[PDB]
Design a protein around this ligand. Structure first.
Ligand SMILES: *[C@@H]1O[C@H](CO)[C@@H](O[C@@H]2O[C@H](CO)[C@@H](O[C@@H]3O[C@H](CO)[C@@H](O)[C@H](O[C@H]4O[C@H](CO)[C@@H](O)[C@H](O)[C@@H]4O[C@H]4O[C@H](CO)[C@@H](O)[C@H](O)[C@@H]4O)[C@@H]3O)[C@H](O)[C@H]2NC(C)=O)[C@H](O)[C@H]1NC(C)=O
Ligand SMILES: *[C@@H]1O[C@H](CO)[C@@H](O[C@@H]2O[C@H](CO)[C@@H](O)[C@H](O)[C@H]2NC(C)=O)[C@H](O)[C@H]1NC(C)=O
Ligand SMILES: *[C@@H]1O[C@H](CO)[C@@H](O[C@@H]2O[C@H](CO)[C@@H](O)[C@H](O)[C@H]2NC(C)=O)[C@H](O)[C@H]1NC(C)=O
Ligand SMILES: *[C@@H]1O[C@H](CO)[C@@H](O[C@@H]2O[C@H](CO)[C@@H](O)[C@H](O)[C@H]2NC(C)=O)[C@H](O)[C@H]1NC(C)=O
Ligand SMILES: *[C@@H]1O[C@H](CO)[C@@H](O[C@@H]2O[C@H](CO)[C@@H](O)[C@H](O)[C@H]2NC(C)=O)[C@H](O)[C@H]1NC(C)=O
Ligand SMILES: *[C@@H]1O[C@H](CO)[C@@H](O[C@@H]2O[C@H](CO)[C@@H](O)[C@H](O)[C@H]2NC(C)=O)[C@H](O)[C@H]1NC(C)=O
Ligand SMILES: *[C@@H]1O[C@H](CO)[C@@H](O[C@@H]2O[C@H](CO)[C@@H](O)[C@H](O)[C@H]2NC(C)=O)[C@H](O)[C@H]1NC(C)=O
Ligand SMILES: *[C@@H]1O[C@H](CO)[C@@H](O[C@@H]2O[C@H](CO)[C@@H](O)[C@H](O)[C@H]2NC(C)=O)[C@H](O)[C@H]1NC(C)=O
Ligand SMILES: *[C@@H]1O[C@H](CO)[C@@H](O[C@@H]2O[C@H](CO)[C@@H](O)[C@H](O)[C@H]2NC(C)=O)[C@H](O)[C@H]1NC(C)=O
Ligand SMILES: *[C@@H]1O[C@H](CO)[C@@H](O[C@@H]2O[C@H](CO)[C@@H](O)[C@H](O)[C@H]2NC(C)=O)[C@H](O)[C@H]1NC(C)=O
Ligand SMILES: *[C@@H]1O[C@H](CO)[C@@H](O[C@@H]2O[C@H](CO)[C@@H](O)[C@H](O)[C@H]2NC(C)=O)[C@H](O)[C@H]1NC(C)=O
Ligand SMILES: *[C@@H]1O[C@H](CO)[C@@H](O[C@@H]2O[C@H](CO)[C@@H](O)[C@H](O)[C@H]2NC(C)=O)[C@H](O)[C@H]1NC(C)=O
Ligand SMILES: *[C@@H]1O[C@H](CO)[C@@H](O[C@@H]2O[C@H](CO)[C@@H](O)[C@H](O)[C@H]2NC(C)=O)[C@H](O)[C@H]1NC(C)=O
Ligand SMILES: *[C@@H]1O[C@H](CO)[C@@H](O[C@@H]2O[C@H](CO)[C@@H](O)[C@H](O)[C@H]2NC(C)=O)[C@H](O)[C@H]1NC(C)=O
Ligand SMILES: *[C@@H]1O[C@H](CO)[C@@H](O[C@@H]2O[C@H](CO)[C@@H](O)[C@H](O)[C@H]2NC(C)=O)[C@H](O)[C@H]1NC(C)=O
Ligand SMILES: *[C@@H]1O[C@H](CO)[C@@H](O[C@@H]2O[C@H](CO)[C@@H](O)[C@H](O)[C@H]2NC(C)=O)[C@H](O)[C@H]1NC(C)=O
Ligand SMILES: *[C@@H]1O[C@H](CO)[C@@H](O)[C@H](O)[C@H]1NC(C)=O
Ligand SMILES: *[C@@H]1O[C@H](CO)[C@@H](O)[C@H](O)[C@H]1NC(C)=O
Ligand SMILES: *[C@@H]1O[C@H](CO)[C@@H](O)[C@H](O)[C@H]1NC(C)=O
Ligand SMILES: *[C@@H]1O[C@H](CO)[C@@H](O)[C@H](O)[C@H]1NC(C)=O
Ligand SMILES: *[C@@H]1O[C@H](CO)[C@@H](O)[C@H](O)[C@H]1NC(C)=O
Ligand SMILES: *[C@@H]1O[C@H](CO)[C@@H](O)[C@H](O)[C@H]1NC(C)=O
Ligand SMILES: *[C@@H]1O[C@H](CO)[C@@H](O)[C@H](O)[C@H]1NC(C)=O
Lengths: 448, 131, 133, 131, 53, 42
């Protein structure tokens, strides 16, 4: 009566934290794409999500392996898409560049260069004297005057295929059978600690692989309040991730009416050079409503005072310094790569107690994605005017180490690592490994 | 009675071991189905799922519990593994909590189960010889 | 099942035969469900993975119904007349398995869940019965 | 045995068939666990392991010995396969030695086992239909 | 009389390896276990519709 | 400053080599072991 025996149960609801090779799933409704989607399994039009009653699970937004895996997959897809495209080895030649001064505003003075060079023809024994318009950020003086492409002493840029679209498409990261993805449904979750409301799903929601440095664009919004998430808020060397509850619309445009020139640099190889801008030349810029931005910044300050005292003065300053890829809000507006000076966005001081903000942006064509060296990509010019509208879903702030009885806290934007962009989305997800085999004591005994 | 509000994969993960034992088939049926960069990840996932399912099935088979959801064995429970009462295991514990307890002793139990199953097979062979 | 006086037994041989007649040739189909860088190599690997997946898909269902290692396995699930109102003779003598599959396709998932629940109940009842010793 | 010096994979490879028959689980539990071409080759190896395990399991199933380490059968032993005494097989030779002797007659025995299981299944079905 | 190869304005031709042979070798397309290939043995089949044999 | 056993082993070779720019060449020199260079036919 008091003697118990081992009983083997198959299918017990048990799981363990695990790392696996998640595969992608994409909506059927969604010609080729950098994030190859024709190779992704179609998503379930009616996703299944099971509410795990009574289950409290420990999530770690910062030690989540679904983020590093996504980073690796994104880089691999980028490389795969660039593999078949044209390699601009012949473009590393001396350029005789002269300023563009035909209907230029004062701000866009010297930003564009009119360069002429000898380029290989389809025949190996003939050369063509062609010309192209290059942004100042892409040419370096060799020392009217002789220039060279920025990348010519680091690597040969690979031109992006014009028929491959950079537009981010939602990607659902599914788990293999025998594994599960637990979603933290808690609306006030701060990325770390137990989540009292948990549900299990087989695939994550559509996560757009948007690449940006200082502002998180086209992301998911917080449900109740602006959420400040940091691995260690006290530490000033760890970035702070801010998630807005309401989006801030940002209008970005490149007013220049660009013209695309197809220069045939070899058999079956074409170099897409900028021709001549039809009309006046004016700077690229982004607009965010002053009122909406101030409201969102006030909400951010209110939520920040929770972790930094109720009366500390919160002031926003622009990026400290570094290269253009970290001191500016970089993004890709439908083919063209912008680098906006977000100095008007982060400039204010908040005390314990109509118009628009125009951000002057610079365009580049030689892109070093993923902070890699020796692997640059040349973005072909986009014909016509460019205009995109996005939502500033969040921010990536950094705090200064102000010692000596500092009653004020200064937060400035900071990008750098692209994982923080994915982390803002894969913060409520974790992969677990199911253990259907369980042994427990019971009064039952096997019959012989 | 049979009045479950809803049955789903791991739906009983928060329920007591006794209540969760009535939904074994719910988990058991989702253990098999819940080049390009994306083309290799899918193949690896498929292979991994097959391997894990077959590992569990092999462990069941060598214990004599093949094709069974609840299989009773001849291995007596050692109080060293867990001294908790039967009432406080099947009515005040979830399988997740139980697993975190009998984890330093899982391999011992597996070895005992395998040895007992082998002994049972040998004894059955011996008995059939007399007939 | 042992083919006494059978003209010939082969994979899917009794595909046009009635369900009653085709039920004596299950072994023929059962034993052929598992056996039978370059472009061809990848295709062969995918084929092997597909074969293993398809075999295990049915083996798991057999396992969780209590029919493991059986070709014909009786169950405790009563037949709901709503699924099919045809007589027993109207099924096992005037119909083929291909025709039958087209009729109960709408009710397959309902039956499978019933079989799984019945097997779980049987396992629990057996555990309780053995606990009385 | 009841108390063994050590049990390891293929540890009883040199023991007599009688003694090596008490360590079947030791070998049975190690038959399943153990972009580029290296990934593809690894995938092929893992798939091959899975296929071999499944083939062995299917062979057991079609003989009626599903999920059993030691399974008795209805096929009588033909002395042509081997004329050795029972005591001189189970206490004077190892499984490796035994395999080398009946290697020629293995497929015959497998076919006989399959056909005998077919007959047994027919008898079961006929008896069931009789009731 | 100045000429150029036909392909010079479309692509660069890859010379076929002289050792490699172009001779068609019969290929048997096999289906994996769990799949079957049904062959229409009808001698008057016109490619569509039911195949009695 | 060579020994009698290393006479003719090292060759001081000068050549034109491509620059980072496709239209500019650089005259460079390197030391090659006699086992690496073959006379074409100072
Ligand atoms: C955040 O999300 C918003 C919306 O979800 C994003 O804004 C969208 O941005 C995309 C891309 O920038 C934009 O789609 C383009 O709209 C243009 C205007 O309607 C179209 O002209 C354009 O089509 C051309 O480009 C495509 C790129 O793949 C080609 O596939 C297509 O064939 C077109 O190109 C051909 O035609 C042109 C013109 O005839 C010709 O010159 C070419 O040579 C070629 O022959 C795209 O469809 C959406 O309209 C935007 N939506 C909104 C509401 O604004 C925003 O970009 C996101 N933010 C971030 C940071 O990702
Ligand atoms: C960039 O420079 C080129 C010349 O290198 C300009 O193109 C020439 O412009 C002159 C004057 O309009 C014409 O007479 C020529 O026929 C044009 N072609 C060439 C090959 O010289 C071009 O207009 C300049 N673009 C800008 C924006 O300044
Ligand atoms: C032409 O382009 C050159 C190269 O960018 C620039 O020359 C500079 O002009 C500014 C304004 O006086 C000064 O910084 C220097 O005189 C120049 N040197 C630099 C920038 O290194 C300018 O954009 C244009 N100048 C002329 C004369 O055409
Ligand atoms: C492009 O090629 C032309 C000719 O191939 C170059 O023009 C030569 O420049 C050198 C410079 O000293 C002169 O000695 C030659 O007489 C020129 N040849 C001509 C004009 O036929 C030109 O420098 C090259 N670079 C460009 C156009 O940027
Ligand atoms: C490639 O060239 C660029 C520009 O000529 C180099 O960048 C400069 O590098 C020197 C290093 O001595 C620094 O002092 C300068 O401040 C850099 N200037 C800029 C604008 O980057 C770059 O280092 C070169 N890369 C290689 C590998 O030689
Ligand atoms: C979060 O960051 C703070 C500050 O970096 C950590 O506190 C420091 O801990 C180290 C380790 O002994 C001490 O040397 C410092 O003096 C501490 N500084 C302060 C301001 O407390 C804290 O440990 C971090 N939290 C975690 C969980 O690692
Ligand atoms: C961003 O905002 C600026 C300033 O409101 C816009 O520039 C104005 O554009 C209108 C025509 O749409 C002109 O009448 C004004 O003179 C412009 N003002 C200035 C200061 O240049 C600009 O169009 C907006 N762009 C986007 C993409 O929103
Ligand atoms: C940018 O410039 C191009 C080229 O002029 C413009 O496209 C032309 O627009 C006119 C307007 O009536 C049409 O008649 C032509 O058929 C268009 N194609 C040509 C000229 O090749 C385009 O509209 C301009 N975009 C602007 C100003 O936003
Ligand atoms: C961003 O651009 C959108 C349009 O793309 C602007 O929305 C328009 O705003 C004007 C001015 O009030 C209205 O007349 C239109 O009806 C609006 N259209 C739509 C579709 O919203 C928006 O105001 C811009 N925001 C900023 C900050 O520049
Ligand atoms: C950030 O804002 C400041 C002030 O609004 C800009 O002004 C420069 O600040 C730096 C200090 O980091 C000084 O050394 C310079 O003298 C200031 N003037 C100029 C013209 O640079 C600063 O440039 C802004 N930086 C960024 C990256 O936006
Ligand atoms: C970002 O924009 C700010 C102003 O919008 C720039 O700061 C100005 O820089 C110019 C010269 O570049 C100075 O003449 C002004 O006095 C500066 N104003 C202020 C308020 O600082 C800043 O330099 C820009 N960031 C760059 C260029 O990296
Ligand atoms: C940062 O914010 C300060 C405070 O608003 C700005 O300083 C004022 O800017 C206006 C705009 O032209 C001037 O009229 C005032 O004279 C400035 N007051 C000062 C400097 O004490 C500053 O320009 C902003 N910097 C940016 C947007 O880069
Ligand atoms: C950016 O924010 C806007 C405004 O919140 C979103 O527009 C909403 O879209 C949903 C579904 O598409 C509609 O039901 C709402 O009515 C829209 N709001 C308004 C004010 O029109 C937009 O979806 C967000 N995302 C992007 C990429 O712009
Ligand atoms: C590559 O060159 C061939 C031959 O020069 C081109 O074929 C000719 O194209 C012209 C276009 O006006 C036609 O009028 C001729 O009838 C074509 N002749 C033949 C024999 O094809 C071909 O179009 C060129 N391809 C590209 C992509 O430029
Ligand atoms: C310079 O190097 C050459 C190449 O090794 C040598 O000259 C002769 O090369 C031939 C061919 O290998 C040998 O058979 C002779 O023995 C070499 N020596 C002579 C004197 O002919 C030798 O090393 C050097 N000769 C010089 C400097 O005259
Ligand atoms: C490297 O190139 C230079 C110039 O292209 C070569 O030197 C020329 O050689 C030819 C005959 O071969 C002479 O007619 C010229 O007068 C030479 N010019 C100069 C400037 O020297 C040289 O031979 C090539 N090879 C090496 C190793 O330098
Ligand atoms: C997140 O919340 C947990 C409690 O659930 C707390 O321990 C941790 O410090 C918080 N992290 C922050 C505020 O960065
Ligand atoms: C945003 O609000 C703060 C605090 O009231 C104020 O100092 C600042 O001027 C506002 N921004 C504007 C008016 O652009
Ligand atoms: C900080 O101030 C807010 C103001 O609403 C108050 O609700 C909160 O209790 C304060 N926290 C303190 C004093 O710790
Ligand atoms: C299990 O073993 C680990 C490591 O030896 C030990 O830290 C832990 O306390 C043990 N717990 C139980 C319940 O045996
Ligand atoms: C099966 O269901 C489909 C969809 O509801 C229906 O069109 C069809 O008639 C049904 N067939 C049978 C035999 O119930
Ligand atoms: C044993 O096998 C031999 C063939 O090897 C056959 O001639 C003989 O009849 C068989 N005997 C029995 C009893 O099966
Ligand atoms: C098995 O057959 C081979 C020939 O195929 C023969 O040499 C060997 O002696 C046989 N082994 C036996 C009968 O044990």
């Amino acid at each position: 009566a008091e003697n118990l025996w081992v009983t083997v149960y198959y299918g017990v609801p048990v799981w363990k934290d695990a790392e696996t090779t998640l595969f992608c799933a994409s909506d059927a409704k969604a010609k080729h794409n950098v994030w190859a989607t024709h190779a992704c399994v179609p998503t379930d039009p009616n996703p299944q999500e099971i509410h795990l009653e009574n289950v409290t699970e420990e999530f770690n937004m910062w030690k989540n392996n679904m983020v590093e895996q996504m980073h690796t997959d994104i880089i691999s897809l980028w490389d795969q898409s660039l593999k078949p495209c044209v390699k601009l080895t012949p473009l590393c030649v001396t350029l005789q560049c002269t300023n563009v001064t035909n209907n230029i505003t004062d701000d866009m003075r010297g930003e564009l260069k009119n360069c002429s060079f000898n380029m290989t023809t389809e025949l190996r024994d003939k050369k063509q004297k062609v010309y192209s318009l290059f942004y100042r950020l892409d040419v370096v003086q060799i020392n009217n005057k002789e220039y060279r492409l920025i990348n010519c002493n680091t690597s040969a840029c690979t031109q992006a295929c014009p028929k491959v679209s950079f537009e981010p498409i939602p990607i659902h990261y599914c788990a293999p059978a025998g594994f599960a993805i637990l979603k933290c449904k808690d609306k006030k979750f701060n990325g770390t600690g137990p989540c009292p409301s948990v549900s299990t799903v087989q695939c994550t929601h559509g996560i757009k692989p948007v690449v940006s440095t200082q502002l998180l664009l086209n992301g998911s919004l917080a449900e109740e309040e602006v959420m400040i998430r940091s691995e260690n808020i006290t530490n000033n060397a760890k970035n702070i991730l801010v998630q807005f509850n309401t989006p801030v619309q940002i209008n970005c445009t490149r007013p220049n009416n660009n013209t695309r020139k197809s220069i045939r640099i070899g058999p079956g190889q074409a170099f897409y050079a900028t021709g001549d801008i039809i009309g006046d030349i004016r700077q690229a810029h982004c607009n965010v409503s002053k009122a909406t931005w101030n409201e969102t910044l006030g909400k951010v300050v209110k939520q920040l005072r929770k972790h930094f005292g109720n009366n500390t003065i919160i002031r926003f300053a622009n990026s400290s310094g570094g290269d253009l890829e970290v001191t500016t809000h970089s993004f890709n507006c439908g083919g063209e790569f912008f680098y906006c000076n977000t100095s008007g966005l982060f400039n204010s001081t908040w005390i314990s107690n109509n118009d628009s903000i125009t951000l002057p942006c610079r365009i580049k064509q030689i892109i070093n994605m993923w902070q890699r060296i020796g692997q640059c990509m040349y973005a072909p010019p986009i014909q016509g005017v460019i205009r995109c509208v996005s939502n500033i879903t969040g921010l990536i702030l950094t705090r200064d180490g102000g010692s000596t009885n500092s009653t004020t806290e200064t937060f400035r934007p900071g990008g750098g690592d692209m994982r923080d962009n994915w982390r803002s989305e894969l913060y409520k997800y974790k992969v677990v490994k199911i253990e259907p085999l369980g042994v427990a004591p019971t009064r039952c005994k096997r019959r012989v | 009675g049979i009045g479950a509000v809803f049955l789903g994969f791991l739906g009983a993960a928060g329920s007591t071991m006794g209540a969760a034992s009535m939904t074994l088939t719910v988990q058991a049926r989702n253990l098999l189905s819940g080049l390009t960069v994306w083309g290799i990840k899918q193949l690896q996932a498929r292979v991994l799922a097959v391997e894990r399912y077959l590992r569990d099935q092999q462990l069941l088979g060598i214990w004599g519990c093949s094709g069974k959801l609840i299989c009773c064995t001849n291995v007596p429970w050692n109080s060293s593994w867990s001294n908790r009462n039967l009432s406080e295991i099947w009515d005040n514990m979830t399988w997740l909590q139980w697993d975190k307890e009998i984890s330093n002793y899982t391999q011992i139990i597996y070895g005992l189960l395998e040895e007992s199953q082998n002994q049972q097979e040998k004894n059955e062979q011996d008995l059939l010889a007399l007939d």
